[PDB]
Design a protein around this ligand. Structure first.
Ligand code: FES
Ligand code: FES
Ligand code: FES
Ligand code: FES
Ligand code: FES
Ligand code: FES
Ligand SMILES: [Fe+2]
Ligand SMILES: [Fe+2]
Ligand SMILES: [Fe+2]
Lengths: 104, 389, 389, 390, 104, 107
């Protein structure tokens, strides 16, 4: 079920970490300030890795075409993205980052 | 939205949305061809509101997909590959889409692609009515076709026959010319006037107030939006054209009275009743293809009680009405539209035009169109909507 | 009047108005056709300084109206309707104008219109001289034609004959080529050289100071403004062209001395004297049609005391001068002008050109034109002047 | 720079230089014609990277001068006047330049002009190799030609034959199509497949990680920069194309194995090996002419040890390879390129394209090109470089 | 001769008031500050009603094409207008506005 | 002819340009940048313009024809379209008198 991703301190504020999942699409864990969010890593508009994009507040900018999503709702924030990103609730307990097993 | 210089749009406060609508109004139904022009399993291409489209008939039903692959943007029609009854495969990298919903259901060049089932090619509703093919060039659930058609066009006993072609002028120049009360002057020498013994004045001397010059319909039982030209209600028909007091031209004194009522309706279709004969009606659309061209979709309707009358009507249409009216009368409208192209090409004619009394009809249409259109088609709709957070 | 990038105009400080005058100079007389080309009651179309015009001959006198109806901006010429001797009726809604003052005197589609007698179609003065039709493309009462003609063109005894055609290049490229002292090199193989035994150098080695290279005329009692090319007064004509000290080309050593008196005059007419023969003169205009084209109005003058000489001159003009000179000699000027189009098309050529000595003549012309033109034609003059506040 | 709307360039952070290079990359060697097409004292005109050029052969050697007089900017080629063996004289006012260094050495219309010996018409290095004419459209001393050529093109025994033509599409569309792993689908019905018994899949099911899909070359000793398409090293080739799980098309099961070694190199040349036959190689350039067109410079190489062999190859080339491969196989690439024109013409396609896995190869090329190109050709290079005293 | 328009108090400064006349074309009354003016209501460039326009100082802008006139002189102030507007005499006798039947 | 007498250092204000005509030779241009004097050919290398008729902005002279410019100290182009360096002539002040070299400096 829940996936133990990393220690909260393993990520500096404003950074993104790609989480590979054997037999499944990779995820992207974002650290916005002292909060953590997670979505599918692959941009819904192509093959770009959002973990290699630019984080502006709660909005992740795709490195390929400048499309963007709100990492909290997964909804597109900038064109050309039109397909909502899969979102995974995140929980931080005892300084450890956990991400829901399935989109939700 | 944003198709014309902002300085020009700021000047035309009476109808800025209309002047901006170079490419037409989105979210309306538009006729583009006749049912008999598209057969089972034979995809057809066309351009509507600047968008390249593909229409196919599967099991008798019509489907419409945007003719542009999601991958590298090529037109699928360059080399059509319909490998299964319900799909079309792009000739480039084999991305395959379902005609029914446009879903990317397969990719022959990579059956394991993560894109499969995760993308959708744009689809548009298509409905056949009265032998005509209508496409809802819009987003979301479409309204009833009746909203975008003139009254009576969809009457059960109304038999519709027509002709369609591509004309080189912006759609608005076509609409305004058709609803122009004084443009009747260009028809003074039409063979229809003489051959069908029509009474045809050279113009009208307005009477009454400006409000009485037109009748705007803001809502029909089906949400129709249009304007009736009532210049003849209190106006005086002009049958003798004078210059310096001398008669230099005369209207036609035929006995057949036609065009008792003329109305224009969004998205841009004119209804002339009765025409070209007392027992018929004419419904014609000026469909936006791109900023410089439109489909001049002409139709003539006549109530027919049985197959017998429909047969006779069809014979009369082919032997007389099509050549004498649709062509013999309306051909002059075609070059008239083309004649206004230069003046409005730089969008400056919308400011420099000098209107006179009968143009109250055109002004009413411009305002109605500006206030009730369902959306302005932009170049961005064509290439891909843009928005930056 | 902003026809070119401001950054470029800022760079060419010595002649910015000239560089900005891409559409030509307004408020000057311009020849557009020959008298024998416009007959009684037969309106003719033409474009001058970007404006579409109509010329008509009524009772032997010429009249010019802008070929654009005030109403919806169509060209009246699409379907000419001159219903009375003194008027022209627009084929669209019958707005009728008087040829003599452009006043909207009648409207057949609505004789009660408030526009009647209140609007006026733009008119332009027209004058015929030496069998040539001149139009004053300007506003207000026109100056005397002589102001915009080279000296002697209007001489009573001067018989004028010529030809006109449309050339694909901006008018300025034609003017500069014509007044270019060193471009004589492109004429070294002209049939006129051998066939008319002319003396013709390949170029000139200038002598004296800058001021001595030309004679700027700004004191002409008639108001004429122009420049004389005086490169040959102190210069040594080149008759043996060398490369590495080796002679590779020779000029023409004929006995006829010609073109020793060359001058350019606003709005853009060249005078070559004597040419193509020691007893003749050549006057040619480069009239702006639009930013990419001009009329190459060529005329040859020869004093004639009577009909006998006029017939003889006419005969030689047709059999020798026109084919051997106007065409045999000047044809090379046509493609030479066209050859410069690309370099100046983006306005960059006006900055990147690398001039040499003989171009002093061209520079003098650019400055004279910049300082003495009567106005800069703009696209707004074409569509309709614009002003706020 | 300044070829594309800045708003668009800001969006494609991964390869902005490449998207901006609509006119191609300056300071690289480019083939423009075959040696046999330019004869002694027979100047030829051509446009490369938007610039009009003149090429001439003098005493066997090739020289290249910009086809635009310094004076009034006309093309010298409108009326060529080569009055002496080592010079060309403008037909307008006779400014004369030396083919060897472009120096304005004489002016027939004014032998006393101060401009004489004080102006220089732009010249570009020209080199002939393997029967191909290469022009270095750049400034300063040129690098070795080998830097801008694919490996083996210059091999001693490699006999090169080819065909060249002008195609109506931007050069980048031609490059991407050529290096596009999955575009192989458009060639499924080529006469070359059946007539030369080729094994040709319909596509590929990628395997492994991103890094493994290609091999970026930036360590070559000659300085060449390029990318190898390794999609087939972990990917399973597709021979049965399915829709809804049902087979609707199959690939070719021929005996001859070809094109399992594909690479694209700056400035824009593809190497397919072996192709179109197991004992041959194909090297093709997509040379920028202007923003809308390119030269499709095709060459086929085959090792030959003597005149007897290279002669046999030439006959096979004319009777089979040219009509069956260069035309029979690549003609489909031509209209495929043209088909992408509209989408990218407004520069919006660079933002709206929806890529899939095999495009990983194209992305790698876009990144390599953006990082290792030697300069962006601009419209200013064409009209005249501009600079304002700061 | 004169016609009763309204009470000077009924018009806020910077406003326009259309005056319909029987058997005649409509007029427009403008209150510029504490002064009143009158001209034809119909724009000379077309068929627009100037009373439906925008008043800025003593300049009225036509709603149709943005042309303008000085309400005091009736002279064109902004293109595309070129034909001067007809001006009518106004009088404020005892807190009451009146407009002359004919143009001055 | 080595040194040509121009004028008195006094006759020139800071930031001005003076044209020096020479018998049988091309004209020179002398520029006063502050209290320092410099000189180059007067004719713009890009055409036939007289630089002495241009605008001096510090040590950079702007040609009146096309906006090209040169650094008056080095003679190197400062603004397009100019690309050919100007010949520079040494200037020295002896007894408050300005003198310009008759031959340009070489490399
Ligand atoms: S791949 Fe992310 S915006 Fe296109
Ligand atoms: S462009 Fe259609 S599958 Fe690639
Ligand atoms: S456009 Fe001429 S009368 Fe209407
Ligand atoms: S344009 Fe070539 S010498 Fe003048
Ligand atoms: S109708 Fe008033 S500005 Fe045109
Ligand atoms: S002549 Fe000086 S910048 Fe051109
Ligand atoms: Fe009509
Ligand atoms: Fe000439
Ligand atoms: Fe291919």
């Amino acid at each position: 079920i829940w996936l133990k991703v990393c220690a909260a301190s393993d990520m500096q504020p404003g950074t993104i970490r790609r989480v590979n999942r054997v037999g499944a699409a990779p995820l992207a864990v974002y650290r916005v300030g002292d909060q953590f969010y997670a979505t599918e890593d692959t941009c819904t508009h192509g093959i770009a890795s959002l973990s290699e994009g630019t984080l502006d507040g709660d909005v992740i900018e795709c490195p390929f075409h400048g499309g963007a999503f709100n990492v909290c709702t997964g909804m597109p924030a900038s064109s050309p993205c039109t397909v909502p990103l899969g979102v995974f609730e995140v929980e931080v307990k005892e300084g450890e980052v956990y991400v829901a097993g399935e989109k939700k | 939205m944003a198709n014309v210089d902002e300085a020009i749009l700021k000047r035309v406060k009476g109808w800025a949305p209309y002047v901006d609508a170079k490419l037409g109004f989105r979210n309306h139904w538009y006729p583009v061809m006749f049912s008999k022009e598209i057969n089972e399993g034979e995809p057809k291409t066309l351009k509507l509101l600047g968008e390249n489209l593909l229409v196919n008939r599967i099991d008798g039903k019509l489907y419409c997909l945007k003719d542009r692959c999601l991958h590298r943007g090529v037109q699928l029609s360059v080399k059509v590959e319909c490998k299964t009854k319900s799909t079309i495969t792009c000739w480039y990298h084999a991305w395959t889409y379902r005609w029914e919903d446009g879903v990317l259901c397969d990719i022959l060049t990579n059956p394991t692609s993560a894109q499969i089932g995760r993308q959708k090619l744009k689809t548009y509703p298509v409905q056949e009515a009265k032998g005509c093919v209508f496409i809802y060039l819009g987003d979301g659930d479409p309204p009833p076709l009746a909203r975008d058609t003139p009254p009576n066009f969809l009457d059960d006993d109304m038999e519709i026959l027509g002709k369609n072609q591509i004309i080189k002028s912006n759609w608005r120049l076509a609409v305004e010319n058709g609803f122009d009360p004084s443009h009747i002057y260009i028809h003074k020498d039409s063979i229809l006037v003489k051959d069908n013994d029509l009474a045809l004045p050279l113009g009208f001397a307005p009477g009454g107030d400006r409000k009485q010059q037109t009748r705007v319909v803001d809502d029909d039982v089906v949400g129709r939006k249009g304007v009736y030209d009532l210049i003849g209600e209190h106006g005086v028909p002009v049958f003798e054209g004078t210059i310096g007091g001398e008669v230099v031209r005369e209207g036609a004194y035929g006995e057949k009275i036609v065009a008792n009522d003329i109305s224009i309706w969004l998205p841009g279709v004119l209804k002339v009743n009765p025409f070209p004969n007392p027992d018929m009606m004419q419904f014609e659309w000026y469909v936006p293809i791109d900023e410089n061209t439109h489909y001049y979709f002409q139709t003539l309707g006549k109530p027919c009680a049985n197959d017998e009358e429909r047969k006779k009507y069809e014979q009369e249409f082919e032997s007389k009405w099509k050549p004498m009216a649709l062509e013999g009368f309306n051909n002059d409208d075609i070059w008239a539209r083309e004649a206004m192209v230069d003046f409005y090409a730089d969008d400056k004619g919308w400011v420099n035009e000098i209107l006179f009394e009968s143009d109250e009809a055109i002004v009413a249409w411009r305002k109605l169109a500006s206030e009730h259109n369902q959306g302005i088609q932009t170049q961005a709709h064509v290439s891909g909507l843009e928005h930056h957070h």
